[PDB]
Design a protein around this motif. Sequence first.
Motif, PDB file in Angstrom:
ATOM      1  N   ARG A 269     -11.462  -4.466 -13.484  1.00  0.00           N
ATOM      2  CA  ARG A 269     -10.492  -5.527 -13.212  1.00  0.00           C
ATOM      3  C   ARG A 269      -9.127  -5.111 -13.761  1.00  0.00           C
ATOM      4  N   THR A 270      -8.583  -4.060 -13.160  1.00  0.00           N
ATOM      5  CA  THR A 270      -7.287  -3.534 -13.552  1.00  0.00           C
ATOM      6  C   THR A 270      -6.172  -4.245 -12.790  1.00  0.00           C
ATOM      7  N   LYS A 271      -4.935  -3.919 -13.152  1.00  0.00           N
ATOM      8  CA  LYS A 271      -3.794  -4.450 -12.427  1.00  0.00           C
ATOM      9  C   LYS A 271      -3.750  -3.867 -11.017  1.00  0.00           C
ATOM     10  N   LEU A 272      -3.158  -4.630 -10.104  1.00  0.00           N
ATOM     11  CA  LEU A 272      -3.190  -4.288  -8.690  1.00  0.00           C
ATOM     12  C   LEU A 272      -2.429  -2.996  -8.410  1.00  0.00           C
ATOM     13  N   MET A 273      -2.966  -2.210  -7.472  1.00  0.00           N
ATOM     14  CA  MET A 273      -2.349  -0.969  -7.003  1.00  0.00           C
ATOM     15  C   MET A 273      -2.133   0.017  -8.151  1.00  0.00           C
ATOM     16  N   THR A 274      -3.248   0.435  -8.746  1.00  0.00           N
ATOM     17  CA  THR A 274      -3.258   1.437  -9.810  1.00  0.00           C
ATOM     18  C   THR A 274      -2.378   1.029 -10.988  1.00  0.00           C
TER      19      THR A 274
ATOM     20  N   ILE B  75       0.200 -11.161  -9.844  1.00  0.00           N
ATOM     21  CA  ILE B  75      -0.470  -9.888  -9.604  1.00  0.00           C
ATOM     22  C   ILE B  75       0.215  -9.119  -8.482  1.00  0.00           C
TER      23      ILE B  75
ATOM     24  N   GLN C 132      -2.155  -9.141 -19.595  1.00  0.00           N
ATOM     25  CA  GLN C 132      -2.433 -10.378 -18.875  1.00  0.00           C
ATOM     26  C   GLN C 132      -3.921 -10.505 -18.566  1.00  0.00           C
ATOM     27  N   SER C 133      -4.598  -9.365 -18.469  1.00  0.00           N
ATOM     28  CA  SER C 133      -6.036  -9.366 -18.243  1.00  0.00           C
ATOM     29  C   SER C 133      -6.764  -9.928 -19.459  1.00  0.00           C
TER      30      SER C 133
ATOM     31  N   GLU D 171      -5.024 -16.947 -24.785  1.00  0.00           N
ATOM     32  CA  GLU D 171      -4.797 -16.630 -23.374  1.00  0.00           C
ATOM     33  C   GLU D 171      -4.521 -17.874 -22.527  1.00  0.00           C
TER      34      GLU D 171
ATOM     35  N   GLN E 237      -7.151 -12.075  -6.990  1.00  0.00           N
ATOM     36  CA  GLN E 237      -7.118 -10.826  -6.242  1.00  0.00           C
ATOM     37  C   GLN E 237      -7.806 -10.972  -4.891  1.00  0.00           C
TER      38      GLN E 237
ATOM     39  N   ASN F 109      -5.623   1.142   0.005  1.00  0.00           N
ATOM     40  CA  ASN F 109      -4.287   1.099  -0.577  1.00  0.00           C
ATOM     41  C   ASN F 109      -4.139   0.041  -1.662  1.00  0.00           C
ATOM     42  N   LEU F 110      -5.166  -0.775  -1.901  1.00  0.00           N
ATOM     43  CA  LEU F 110      -5.100  -1.782  -2.953  1.00  0.00           C
ATOM     44  C   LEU F 110      -5.586  -1.262  -4.297  1.00  0.00           C
ATOM     45  N   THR F 111      -6.537  -0.333  -4.299  1.00  0.00           N
ATOM     46  CA  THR F 111      -7.072   0.213  -5.541  1.00  0.00           C
ATOM     47  C   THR F 111      -7.329   1.711  -5.420  1.00  0.00           C
TER      48      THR F 111
END
Lengths: 282, 694, 349, 48
Positions: C122-127, B631, C142-143, B526, B674, B667-669
């Motif tokens: 800790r998922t990718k942004l915006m679902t 991201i 990438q996570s 990674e 982050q 609206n972000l999750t």
Amino acid sequence: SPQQICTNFKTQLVLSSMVNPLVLSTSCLKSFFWFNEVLELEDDSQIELAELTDFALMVKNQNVSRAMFVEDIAMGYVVSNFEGVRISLSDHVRMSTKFKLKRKMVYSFSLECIMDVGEIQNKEVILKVVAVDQSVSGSGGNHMLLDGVSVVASLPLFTGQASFDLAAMLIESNLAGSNDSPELSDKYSYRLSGPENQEDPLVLKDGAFYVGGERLSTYKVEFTGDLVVKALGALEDDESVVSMLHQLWPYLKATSQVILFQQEDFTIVHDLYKKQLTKSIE
Amino acid sequence: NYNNRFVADWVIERIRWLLIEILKASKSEDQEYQRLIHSLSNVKLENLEHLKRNSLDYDERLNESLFIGLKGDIRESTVREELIKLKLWFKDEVFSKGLGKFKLTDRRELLESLSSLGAHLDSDVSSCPFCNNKLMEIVYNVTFSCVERSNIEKHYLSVLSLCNKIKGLKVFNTRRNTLLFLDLIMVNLMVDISDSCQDAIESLRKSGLIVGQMVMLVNDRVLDILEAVKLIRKKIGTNPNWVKNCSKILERSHPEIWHHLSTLIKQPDFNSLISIAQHLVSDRPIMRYSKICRHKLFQEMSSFEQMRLFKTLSSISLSLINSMKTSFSSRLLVNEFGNVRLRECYAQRFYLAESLVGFLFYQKTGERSRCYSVYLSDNGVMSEQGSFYCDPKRFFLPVFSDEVLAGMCEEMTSWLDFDTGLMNDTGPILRLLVLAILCSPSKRNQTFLQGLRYFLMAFANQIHHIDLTSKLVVECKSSSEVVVQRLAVGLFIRLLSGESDASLFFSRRFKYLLNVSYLCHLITKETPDRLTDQIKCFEKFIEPKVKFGCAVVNPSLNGKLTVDQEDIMINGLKKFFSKSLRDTEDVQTPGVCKELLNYCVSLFNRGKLKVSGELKNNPFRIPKLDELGNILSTYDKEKLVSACVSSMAERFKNLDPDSTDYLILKNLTLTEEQVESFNEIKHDVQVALAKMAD
Amino acid sequence: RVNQLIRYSGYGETPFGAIEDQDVKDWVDGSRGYRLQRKIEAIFHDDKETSFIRNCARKVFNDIKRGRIFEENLINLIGRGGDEALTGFLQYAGCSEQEVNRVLNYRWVNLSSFGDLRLVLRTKLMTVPTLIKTLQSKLSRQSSVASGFIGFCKSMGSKCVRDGGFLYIKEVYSGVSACTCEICALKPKIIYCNNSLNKVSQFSKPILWDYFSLVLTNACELGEWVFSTVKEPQNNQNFFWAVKPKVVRQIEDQLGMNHVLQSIRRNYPVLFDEHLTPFMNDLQVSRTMDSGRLKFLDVCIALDMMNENLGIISHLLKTRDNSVYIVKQSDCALAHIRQSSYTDWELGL
Amino acid sequence: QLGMNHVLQSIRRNYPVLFDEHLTPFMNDLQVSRTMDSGRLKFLDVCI
RNA sequence: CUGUGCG
Ligand SMILES: [Zn+2]
């Protein structure tokens, strides 16, 4: 051929008991494959002794071990030591009739009925009736409580031919003074109320009934020489074979169906070499 | 769709149908008609026959630069004796002259080449792995200081849980004074505990959870009691009502679920605090920033200490990954060369024995690599174990794998049970190699092990390329790769020094060496640094084209090329197909000869190969491109901030609480990147509301 | 290692949990269901109630394959829950009130009883069962791991379990009473008795029902030879050799597409309408009797419905992907022998 | 015995299209025949 | 949004 399957179930139950004792409840009967008794839609013929109990399994009773001895008819030849009690107004007539019914075989039972009549008080002549209800209670098996519900309506009590001995007796007991077709159960259930229960489990060990450790009776079954040997094969383990062949000859001492002819069939029996077991009983 | 909220959603399609019927009934150009009729349909592959396919006086120059040497009709026997002549020429001009590309193994010289390339002889490092790597030094010190050597604590941990849960509600809208309130509660419950049961601060606390004047607080932060009284001294006189304001606020508009019956409202008696402080002398940490080997001779170590070494490594790895999980939105009370004194650092705890416990101190929080210090506490005495600097993300594997690796060790060693005595000198070497690999995760180590796998493939077999040794060497830095490389080459030699030809128990040796080489998978893949990773990705992306000389500058992005662009375009096309079948100078440059293509195509067309062109089942039946891996993208940030600002303007029909930030969370999750992006967008929306306010 | 990893998060070890310990070479001819059944069997030292439930399942299978006439009523009885469905199975098989209040004594805590563990990672942004999701995935076309586990631990300490209402985990595990009545002590923190969970009873389900469900699942999966009792048997570390699976399947092994869809339409039209097949134009092939009423898929579909830890239908329509296994004679020597005598007990014909 | 709400479930299962139109618009107790009112009779499935 | 445990 119903007879062959019947004797086959008989041998299966005998030899399954040959390894360890067991109870004859639905856990140890309905868990066997053979079970063609609920088959045979024309079920006129049955095995022998168990012909009684399975006659109720066709309606699937939740019982453990009833004392089925209808060979000594329990429905008939019954003592009629019956009586009655006073009433308690709520016209409302409340009665509690207790009996000590017995059976032809060695058995006893006490059955009490609580009965309520909602009637109309008369002016002078007799009475005026509206509605009647009854409820059974007390000890009694599938045949004993059926006996009780049959005899409770065949008694010289209130229902029948008058027999209402008033004589200002029950009123004196109620008012303190010293001056002058409910036959829908047909089951083992004690009619929604009764005394303590769940005792005396029967165990079956060597083809003989053991209510608590006492031998009752043993029935008959054949083994041919092919069914016995082919049933001797594996099960799962070997000391089961040891126990079953050690106990087979003691059961053979109560039977005269010596039809195992001496040929190579004896050798195919002999494949499981257990000589001192089969020579121990002698 | 053309739908809206003004019509009955059944007339727009009829309007479109009538409009297209009118336009196809009569007209009055060429492409405009087709575009307009194509833009009013609903749904519509290959066979793009309606396309124009027009020329712009440049297609030709492509054509005679690509389709002049292509015939595809050459017969077969001419190919045959052309190949015969080619082979006859090749035999006595380049092969007899020693300009080949493959050669025999000659195993022995390959062994000396391997020993020269791998085993460093000009390096000043010592042959002692523990003292070349900081982490292994620390773990060795811990394990050899450990091997040779009551409701108060649970109540304390429960109240820690209570305070650490209540801190997360952020019901005071402030941070610094909130931590002041929490540590005031902490010192109050200290003095409540220490009032009676005198055998609690010296017995159940020194052997429990405390070190020299350093007491843990909420958020895994350890604070000095001295500075605690110093900060409690302030807010008195300037605003003595402060604590009172902190008292009525936990009842009203609060969860009101607390066990702080008396440990909260009590005024902290400073005399007890200073008495406790003077009870314990100062053993303040040093955290050494920025030569004799007596290291027990691991090759002469018992068969017990190594598993405990692995266990201590696992404990340290779990402590590191716990330090990973500390809070990000945390700021120290007081901010801070070669020796920095620690007074308000962060700490993590890890357990070793019934009395002695290890502590890992670190100064910054976050996501990336940091520097840490390892300390021990035997019976209240605090000792120096060491310090190091690394990236915790690369220590997830050994978190609990202290037993599977051991089992791998004995099973791999028992693979070689054919000779009694070969296990004894290879087992501990393999285990030390594994330890070094786990404690030093880097790309160089796994690349070197891959080079070993290729070396084994070449050695065990018979014929190999002449440019093999040049692809096995990787430059070494930090003096940590030298020890692992030395261990690997020593194991290889010890297993292959003598007569090790393919006439003995060689298959199992090959298997063992192949597994040793595959041990490279232990390192996580990674990208330790990402920016340098795009640097290198672009570097190797653009080096070949710049070397060839055909990478032009930004085009028109619409289908127009300037005269220079098309000139160099044709130049590159010609250079691609400008290779002859006789000159040996062009054996490494990209390109191909059209003649041999003619040979191959003509030979394949006339069913001469194993396959032909007798095919069946005829084949003819919003991210930004400038930033990949980020991201969030600028378009997306602008869209989200515009949506939020429009919503807030719509709701203003002023006053706005912090609940606007809740919309940001709706609206972000969140990682550190982050939360930085979230902070940036919060900033943007806040000053957006500010500018609309004016 | 994985059991310790999941336990460290505060979830608490469960009877299924991760892969069982103390396994054998019998990864061959065995799916997730078989190893889970093996773990459950190994939980109980002296197998008596497990043996009784296996006899119950053997009887149910005997009468569900060809015996008597049955099936499609189990569809009715299983949908209620765990207790009543298991009881009803008992008197369809033969039992007593003693069995009812005896077998149902063993209970285990299921945190995902009123749904699923709510959590954000800790998922990718915006679902809804996972089986419907598996069908939806099948029809359509990438996570860092350290940070993933960090987020798992972060989300595992918040209000995650659901009731009625959201709440923590620790009060659920502290509401249990340590009665220690000699029946909740043979496997601590795994199985409990009825009176030990009077304070909290919503998250309490019997384990014998799960064992019965998995036994029936193996009956549909890889034959009826999993009904017998395990018997134990009475090499130079270098003898490697290859094994082929010895599974026998009585569920029409081919198991083409468009067979589960018709069954789920017939039994559960409501589940078929919504959350299922909006994106389909070839409904007609599966609509006009694409081999309806399979050998066993009709009954072995509801068990994946009710129990959210089987993963059987999504396992069913896939290749073994191995078709061969390398093993040593050393591990073959001590492998357990589990071969069953016939369920007819082979005197029948 | 052949009680009510047995043919309806069979015709729904086998022929949903015939069940939807021309059948049961005027009914409010669909649920009793909907959640397994003794589906899959002895012979009504084939003799329908 | 909102982590406290490997004895
Ligand atoms: Zn050294």
